[PDB]
Design a protein around this ligand. Structure first.
Ligand SMILES: Nc1ncnc2c1ncn2[C@@H]1O[C@H](COP(=O)(O)OP(=O)(O)O)[C@@H](O)[C@H]1O
Ligand SMILES: Nc1ncnc2c1ncn2[C@@H]1O[C@H](COP(=O)(O)OP(=O)(O)O)[C@@H](O)[C@H]1O
Ligand SMILES: Nc1ncnc2c1ncn2[C@@H]1O[C@H](COP(=O)(O)OP(=O)(O)O)[C@@H](O)[C@H]1O
Ligand SMILES: [Mg+2]
Ligand SMILES: [Mg+2]
Ligand SMILES: [Mg+2]
Lengths: 393, 366, 366, 366, 57
């Protein structure tokens, strides 16, 4: 009664040792506000600065320490790379969007890169402007979403290089981010007109829209939760960063609205469906704040904040399959400095050294539920769940 | 209804969050009989031990801020919840106070006792010096907390503490009480037993004061009877003391009276300020806050201002803040803190402690 | 109402076009706490970081004219538009300044931030040395812009710049501030933290000067106390400095004091003139313009005239132009340029940048 | 028979040129009585002050490499020549050692005392870091001289010093002794007087070590008693310390433990190398020489190698040279230098000093 | 003194902390070695310095 019932009220962040970091990495200098980093249990992908065109550095997780300046990179784009996203169903497939108005899908060798990679597997050319948004389908296999600066959202079939759907007359201004829902049947997007839109891609219709979700003119984000709600980070009229929770069945007023501070930089939300914990990481900030989303009011509970002395240029989150379960680790964040990638370990303090069933429920596995052909027909399936107990040592 | 417990070396103040003054203030003593019973309770804690001290041997479970006996320590806490506050400890969250630079082992035992013996639903530990700054409504200042066991100087700037500049002086009210006993023998009065120590402590709290100029006051007392005062013993005898009124508190500013090599409270405060950054010393000079019962002598604030001014540069404004309630500043600041809506995130649940241990208490605490 | 923003290594000057002086002048520093908060903002930029520097670690986003952290660089610009000027960047065109021989990558990042992060309607980037010539009302001359990060010598003849004759000297006010810190230790004063760096910088800006004859001044300081000056520290302590007043600025003319192999500012200016064509050296000798805060030392113009005269032929007339407002010459020239009727053709629209990219910025800019 | 005197902040080493080890090594302390004599020498210097330290107030004439009292400084020198060495200072030339970047005023006073007070026939002052490199038999390398008052990093290449690359760290053995005193209070042991400072210093010199992995060592110390050691006090009491063995030396690599904003000795050494020319950094990486008593911790060479390797490029070979006799490297190098045939030209006569003054001492010395 | 020699002359009533910029008697080009007040004049003092001169003030 005195203390709100929670398991993550004492989660603390702890950066890894110096020898476990990645140094001498020329991180990208693009003003586009993206994560600049994508990490799977196998490789680490960081967008890097190239003299000509664009490239991103893909290196194995075991390759820590100082990185050679002549290390091979994935340099195939003729323009700077904006977004990178690993395939959830294939640890060696990554899609990258660049300023050359194209989307390329790459195949990474098992042991890494020995020579520079220039020829991709599939080149997607459907955008007339730069593509800064990429999101793989959580369930359907080889289904990729790309949203360029032409205010056009495209659904691609990576296997057949086919454009499944085209959504043009749905965003009047610049699109900030696009996030799929749990099953993959819907996706939410934040636009420059301060409007949150829930759109069905297979039907091309607007499900729900909230105009002026955040009154500020600064960039804002919108992501989908596991239970089916929308968590948005934005700014107020007084240039104060806010967090909001929206019900897709009732958007007249937000369920929650909390103000964090008055600093600049867009807030990038990192959602963990297993723990229902949202990690808010602002660009240029030196702190990581995590909040728990529950049904009890005010539906947004501040847990704690990890504080550092160096601002972050980007940040990627390791999925559940790559975490160290035996050490009660629930999240790992690869914080990007200007010349270094510093992993940060989020650990739930527990006296017992055994496997914690409550901390690790069943998580989505690397096996696709449906296929591209099946998903187009209208089939909906939940992600296949695996057990994290086998990872205990 | 959260509980605020400020347990010191000499006195224990307890009460409820939101109140203006502690509801239960009793000496932190445990008395045991030293004679044999001839007519047809083996320990007394607090005021009941003070009313029967003639047949008891009084012992302080805390000496110089160090708990010398944890069995007697639990008696003080048990007497607080059940006999003084008359509440169930398992139904109220408890806010506790700790000395600056408190050892983690001391905090672990205090946390373990509250959660395992008294089964408190929630518990938090706060720094006494920080709480003293809460009561004065300040975020910047250096707190000279002089209690019964030890004296501490904690500089705080804009809500940020400077542990490297925290200085400790092993000289407090109990050391002054023993010094008064020693110098009262020179006048012909012999106090030796532990029961008579409380009598001398009452004399110190009622007749002692700090002289602005010690040498002038000594000359005045040697040529006049104006400074003379009388005290009535519990058995009806009246004792009379002269220069001992200001000689006993003078050991605070001249520790050499006790054979100590350390410097006085005025120099300890000045040295703590000098250990801070240069850009923050100006704010610490004008925000010197006095806390604790030992700082309750009449004229101690004027002497503190005069001594520090002679040490600080002439261009600095020395301001000594001595609120009339500073004897309970630590508890009042804790009551204010425990009532803040933004403090509810700092509570540590009993269920969280069981599954996590004392590691979550070292974090969330400073 | 066009904005003129002059961002340097140490100081940022901002204001409105047409004004005679910058409205906002604040240090280009970002401070972060280095202690732990104990009382129930993770970064401070500009003056608010200077007022809290005791508990902060001050860092310069620009070092040696190179932006070492673009995340902190955006904080300076955000603090300029919203906290200093209190204007909306999307409603006013912004005129920016760039160092001579500015890398194209540096200009691309600055252009991208203003058009995407701040969404400015129009933007233009001008050369600092060219703008400093505008404030003096001249079209021909060599500008020695010595600031906080780097010293530049830019010869301009009849409105035509000579990039091949532009010389760079990695020695500016910040290097002199560090040198003053080193030589102040010889007198018994220890300044080590970043907070004390700003204190020493204040000493340099108030007590330092350039001696016409260094050897004679050293002899005068070694046999008299007339060159002694006193400075009061923030904590009220007073320090006295003697020959360090003119020894610190002497590193500008004798870089060997810092272990540097390069030549002094007088020789760098002379070498830049000799790199030009013979027919234009006569006009550059008589039009030597001093710009930046590092040229504000008393007697630096007389020393510069004496040193250059020795290097130059006897028949050439050496004239050093040191306007009293040369600390803000870059901003003043920018406000003059942005107020011209013929400058409206040099603006670059946000819409033009979105459809053409940074290619149109490399053109129309020098 | 020339004399080699190596006077430091904490210890004074003296002897004769040509010997392999100093003949007299005594603490650089001056003790004065703090009680009143009741039974029918007002100062004690060196070992006699250490034997009577229970009734004396021990004071160091040198603090942080700065002589805070020249009257007590002459007592150390007088005790050196007459009591320890038992020689006449007027019959033997004296070779003295000075800290890097020594102020000229400090050198003038030392020269004046040696010639006017002790009337030495000849005298010379050498840099301690250079003498440390003499003992190792090298002409190229960077010397990390950490002692009792201050830590210095001096890079030398082919016998040429680089004063601009010399870095200073206000953190040495005495700061670690005070830190051990602070963290021993968390274990229940109270050391406050100056006499107990020498006891804690003895504990540090006997039980402290540097952990290769600090966090791993803390985990080992928190789950086992293998890192536990016992120390016997002079009065027979036995104290026991655990993780404090490696926590106290860790302040060298993490100065934030003391609230200091500066960097560790590993980064200070790395930063000094980076301040040198690029063509000489390779030789400095492989010739890192440790000197002083503060570098005598077990495992400090391995930790320094690991920390510097993480900073330097992977293609550089990091070699830390830690000779077993490095506690006396400055004296041993001075003994070697004073015995060289090509050194007799560097002596300065008393007659020359009388007719010329300290000017001839600033020359011939670096 | 940083250069030359000087001695501080202050009234007996001027106690307490003395300003670092308090005026001194700085006329010698070398450090002052001895000073002696005139017995017959409380306002006349003679000083000897390392410059081999004696100055009466
Ligand atoms: N009015 C007073 N004048 C002088 N001394 C006092 C006065 N009131 C209390 N004291 C002394 O102050 C000491 C410490 O009181 P307190 O602050 O309760 O100690 P603690 O910090 O251990 O709780 C007591 O030993 C008492 O003798
Ligand atoms: N009166 C002064 N005397 C000497 N140096 C000064 C003075 N005023 C400013 N400076 C120096 O000028 C430097 C910055 O000057 P300025 O060129 O105006 O800005 P920036 O170099 O940052 O563009 C500062 O580092 C400061 O030390
Ligand atoms: N074996 C040892 N282990 C750790 N520290 C030591 C050891 N021996 C001496 N020291 C430390 O070295 C410091 C002084 O060393 P030294 O360089 O000889 O003195 P100084 O710097 O005054 O010349 C002392 O403070 C002492 O604590
Ligand atoms: Mg108390
Ligand atoms: Mg400038
Ligand atoms: Mg030494």
């Amino acid at each position: 009664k005195v203390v709100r019932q929670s398991k993550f009220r004492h989660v603390f962040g702890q950066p890894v040792k110096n020898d476990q970091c990645y140094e001498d990495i020329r991180v990208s200098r693009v003003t586009w506000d993206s994560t600049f980093c994508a990490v799977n249990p196998k490789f680490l992908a960081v967008i890097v600065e190239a003299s000509g065109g664009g490239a991103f550095l893909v290196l194995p997780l075991s390759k820590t320490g100082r990185i050679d300046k002549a290390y091979p990179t994935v340099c195939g784009h003729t323009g700077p790379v904006l977004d990178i996203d690993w395939c959830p169903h294939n640890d060696e497939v990554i899609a990258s969007g660049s300023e050359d108005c194209t989307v390329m899908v790459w195949q990474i060798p098992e042991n890494g890169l020995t020579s520079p990679l220039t020829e991709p597997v599939v080149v997607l050319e459907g955008h007339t402007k730069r593509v800064g948004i990429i999101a793989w389908h959580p369930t359907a296999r080889n289904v990729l979403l790309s949203a360029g600066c032409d205010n056009v959202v495209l659904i691609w079939n990576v296997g057949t290089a086919e454009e499944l759907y085209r959504l043009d007359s749905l965003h009047p201004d610049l699109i900030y981010n696009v996030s799929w829902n749990h099953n993959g049947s819907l996706f939410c997007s934040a636009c420059k007109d301060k409007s949150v839109r829930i759109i069905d891609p297979r039907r091309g219709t607007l499900v729900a829209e909230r105009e002026k979700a955040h009154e500020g003119a600064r960039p804002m984000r919108a992501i989908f939760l596991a239970d089916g709600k929308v968590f948005t980070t934005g700014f107020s009229r007084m240039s104060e960063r806010q967090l909001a929770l929206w019900d897709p069945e009732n958007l007249e007023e937000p369920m929650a609205l909390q103000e964090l501070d008055s600093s600049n930089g867009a807030l990038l939300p990192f959602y963990d469906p297993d723990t229902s914990v949202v990690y808010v990481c602002g660009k240029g900030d030196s702190s990581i704040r995590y909040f728990e989303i529950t049904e009890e009011p005010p539906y947004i509970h501040f847990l704690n904040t990890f504080t550092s002395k160096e601002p972050q240029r980007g940040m990627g989150s390791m999925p559940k399959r790559g975490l160290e379960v035996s050490k009660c680790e629930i999240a790992r964040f690869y914080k990007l400095h200007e010349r270094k990638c510093e992993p940060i370990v989020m650990t739930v303090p527990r006296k017992s050294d055994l496997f914690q069933d409550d901390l690790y429920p069943d998580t989505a596995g690397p096996e696709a539920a449906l296929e591209a052909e099946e998903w187009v027909s209208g089939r909906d399936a939940d992600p296949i769940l695996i057990s994290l107990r086998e990872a205990y040592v | 209804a959260a509980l605020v417990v400020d347990n010191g070396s000499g006195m224990c103040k307890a009460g409820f969050a939101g109140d203006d003054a502690p509801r239960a203030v009793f000496p932190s003593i445990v008395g045991r009989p030293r004679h044999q019973g001839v007519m047809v309770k083996d320990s007394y804690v607090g005021d009941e031990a003070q009313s029967k001290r003639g047949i008891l041997t009084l012992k302080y479970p805390i000496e110089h801020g160090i708990v010398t006996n944890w069995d007697d320590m639990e008696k003080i806490w048990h007497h607080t919840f059940y006999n003084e506050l008359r509440v169930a400890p398992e139904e109220h969250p408890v806010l506790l106070t700790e000395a600056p630079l408190n050892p983690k082992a001391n905090r672990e035992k205090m946390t373990q006792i509250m959660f395992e013996t008294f089964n408190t639903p929630a518990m938090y530990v706060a720094i006494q010096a920080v709480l003293s700054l809460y009561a004065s409504g300040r975020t910047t200042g250096i707190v000279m907390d002089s209690g019964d066991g030890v004296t501490h100087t904690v500089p705080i700037y804009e809500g940020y503490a400077l542990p490297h500049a925290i200085l400790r002086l092993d000289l407090a009210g109990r050391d002054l009480t023993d010094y008064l006993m020693k110098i009262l023998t020179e006048r012909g009065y012999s106090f030796t037993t532990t029961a008579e120590r409380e009598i001398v402590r009452d004399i110190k709290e009622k007749l002692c004061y700090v002289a602005l100029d010690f040498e002038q006051e000594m000359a005045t007392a040697a040529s006049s009877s104006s400074l003379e005062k009388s005290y009535e013993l519990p058995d009806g005898q009246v004792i009379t003391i002269g220069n001992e009124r200001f000689r006993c508190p003078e050991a605070l500013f001249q520790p050499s009276f006790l054979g100590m090599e350390s410097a006085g409270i005025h120099e300890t405060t000045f040295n703590s300020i000098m250990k801070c950054d240069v850009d923050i010393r100006k704010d610490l000079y004008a925000n010197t806050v006095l806390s604790g019962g030992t700082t309750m002598y009449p004229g101690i604030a004027d002497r503190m201002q005069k001594e520090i001014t002679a040490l600080a540069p002439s261009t600095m404004k020395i301001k000594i803040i001595a609120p009339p309630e500073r004897k309970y500043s630590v508890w009042i600041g804790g009551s204010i803190l425990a009532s803040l809506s933004t403090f509810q995130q700092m509570w540590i649940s009993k269920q969280e402690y069981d599954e996590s241990g004392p590691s979550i208490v070292h974090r969330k605490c400073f």
